From Swiss-Prot, chain B:
The keyword NADP does not apply. InterPro entries: Cdc42, P-loop_NTPase, Small_GTP-bd, Small_GTPase, Small_GTPase_Rho. It is found in: Cell membrane; Cytoplasm, Cytoskeleton, Microtubule organizing center, Centrosome; Cytoplasm, Cytoskeleton, Spindle; Midbody. Changing Y32F: Abolishes AMPylation by Haemophilus IbpA. The keyword Cell cycle does not apply. Interacts with CDC42EP1, CDC42EP2, CDC42EP3, CDC42EP4, CDC42EP5, CDC42SE1, CDC42SE2, PARD6A, PARD6B and PARD6G (in a GTP-dependent manner). Interacts with activated CSPG4 and with BAIAP2. Interacts with activated CSPG4 and with BAIAP2. Interacts with DOCK11/Zizimin2; the interaction activates CDC42 by exchanging GDP for GTP. Interacts with DOCK9; the interaction activates CDC42 by exchanging GDP for GTP. Interacts with DOCK8 (via DHR-2 domain); the interaction activates CDC42 by exchanging GDP for GTP. Interacts with IQGAP1. Interacts with NET1 and ARHGAP33/TCGAP. This is Cell division control protein 42 homolog. It comes from Homo sapiens. The lineage of its organism: Eukaryota, Metazoa, Chordata, Craniata, Vertebrata.
Length: 189, 187
């Protein structure tokens, strides 16, 4: 009916699934994260006419490297997710994710989404980080990464406390608004 | 999950493509052989943890000279191949290959690989060599060059009889085992 496909991507355990399910049901899956890689839909009211926002989840694990890209076709905006309290995923945004996306979808915009920020203050997570890199990604450093990789922008959220969250998706909606007739329509293919 | 990139280089017709295909499939391409712009990813088991061995082929032809190096980055070890029954390929190892490789990848180890050894007796090949060539590169001779050009070592094989072949890659595996002090990764 006038679609907006947004494919979520990011290392594993980064909180991709919880982020979507949280956004869509307004309830963080506090007992079992649905093990199914599913699409989601939300009828957004952009302007005056409704738009179908297609939220697509992905399987991050390496095993899916050769398959994952299959869902990429016709995407409008991407969300490269990384857990604010696991530098691991953050490094991968650069070394793995952004490249993959660009490779397959060169004209498709993408936002850098920091996830699990609520944990930026959970001591045990900090005490665990101890391994010298006992430092959770800060907005300061993530932002530059956005600039370098050319992300439309950096937005961060907590699927647990709902903080930001919706914003991430508004930013996703606004970044995806393809032009009118223009042969320059970033819709991936 | 933990790789070892191995790029094969050598003069055309040296038996590069069959060397790979035969090693990976266990059967010499008896009726078809591509040009290769392909990649083979055998799951090697080093230690206790699996390693993905990336076998990359290259188009040796002069035309590809400025482009072929595009695959060089991320390489752990090199295989400079030359067909034992074609001195031409041999000379090119020193004059062409090692340098090219050296310049591009100054820290990446490489191995001197003699190919098509089984031909070192096919009369026709021999009698054709008659034109100033009573000798197909002997291991001893190649070995010498190995020392000179500082290759990790000289290994030879016959993609046809698969003789030695497997060894070539083991040596390739052992040569590429990057300690964490200095990574010979071609940048
Ligand atoms: N007899 C023999 N010839 C070989 C062997 N491996 C390759 N060849 C010969 O190689 C020719 C082409 O070599 P190829 O592998 O296509 O050379 P490349 O382009 O250097 O990879 C084939 O037509 C031959 O059968 C081998 O071990 N034994
Ligand atoms: N505390 C906290 N845990 C989160 C948050 N978002 C995700 N998780 C957790 O992250 C882990 C994996 O998240 P999932 O959504 O399953 O990650 P995926 O691999 O990216 O789909 C689980 O422990 C979730 O309980 C968040 O904002 N807060
Ligand atoms: Mg998931
Ligand atoms: Mg070839």
């Amino acid at each position: 009916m006038q679609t907006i496909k947004c494919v979520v991507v990011g290392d594993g355990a980064v909180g991709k699934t919880c982020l979507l399910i949280s956004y869509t049901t307004n309830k963080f899956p506090s007992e079992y994260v649905p093990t199914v890689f599913d699409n989601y839909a939300v009828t957004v009211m952009i302007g005056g006419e409704p738009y179908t926002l297609g939220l697509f989840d992905t399987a991050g694990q390496e095993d899916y490297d050769r398959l994952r890209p299959l869902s990429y076709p016709q995407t409008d905006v991407f969300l490269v997710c990384f857990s604010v309290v696991s530098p691991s995923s953050f490094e991968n945004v650069k070394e793995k994710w952004v490249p993959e996306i660009t490779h397959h979808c060169p004209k498709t915009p993408f936002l850098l989404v920091g996830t699990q920020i609520d944990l930026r203050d959970d001591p045990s997570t900090i005490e665990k980080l101890a391994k010298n890199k006992q430092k959770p990604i800060t907005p300061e450093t993530a932002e530059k990464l956005a600039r370098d990789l050319k992300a439309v922008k950096y937005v961060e959220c907590s699927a647990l406390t709902q903080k930001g969250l919706k914003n991430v998706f508004d930013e996703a909606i606004l970044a995806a608004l393809e032009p009118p007739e223009p042969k320059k329509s970033r819709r991936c293919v």
